[PDB]
């Protein structure tokens, strides 16, 4: 059985095994988790493009990161989005339970840029939950907004 935690900071200072970006299907640089994770880990973005609703590890730096493709709304109708959310995170629980990944710093998938105006903090944690569940990994969830950091807190605690 897997343990959830939130912590509102800086995904780079993490202090776990692993990793997950919020990365894009081109393995390209972007602004917020993206970027503080290549500032940090820079070498994991060679070869890292995947496409939409699927995840692609790699050991740099002496770091692992997973670069999880969440789907970006504006794109995808809101049914095909949420598929493809869920899928993302699949993709997750699959190479942290194959790779015996033991503790996991996870971000929000989908909720910046690629949240199409909508609010997708809850929408997206659902789904990180429905999938990490699978795992018997440590998951620290990174937010950087105080009202998520409570939300998230909330979410966690009516599990429990």
């Not at 909508?118 to 944690?125: C, E, F, G, I, T």
């Not at 950087?144 to 409570?150: A, F, H, L, Q, Y």
Request: hydrophobic share 40%; charged share 25%.
């Amino acid at each position: 059985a897997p343990s959830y935690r939130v912590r509102r900071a800086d995904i780079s200072g993490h202090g776990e095994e692993a990793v997950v970006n919020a990365a894009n299907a081109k393995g390209t640089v972007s602004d917020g988790v993206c970027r503080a994770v290549a500032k940090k880990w820079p070498s994991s973005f060679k070869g890292a493009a995947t496409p939409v609703g699927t995840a692609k590890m790699i050991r740099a730096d002496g770091m692992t990161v997973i670069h999880a493709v969440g789907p970006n709304f504006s794109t995808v109708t809101e049914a095909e989005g949420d598929r493809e959310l869920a899928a993302a995170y699949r993709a997750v629980a699959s190479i942290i339970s194959t790779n015996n990944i033991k503790s996991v710093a996870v971000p929000l998938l989908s909720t910046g840029t690629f949240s199409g105006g909508k609010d997708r903090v809850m929408q997206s944690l659902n789904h990180l939950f429905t999938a990490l569940d699978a795992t018997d990994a440590d998951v620290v969830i990174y937010c950087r907004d105080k009202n998520w950091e409570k939300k998230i807190q909330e979410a966690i605690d009516r599990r429990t």
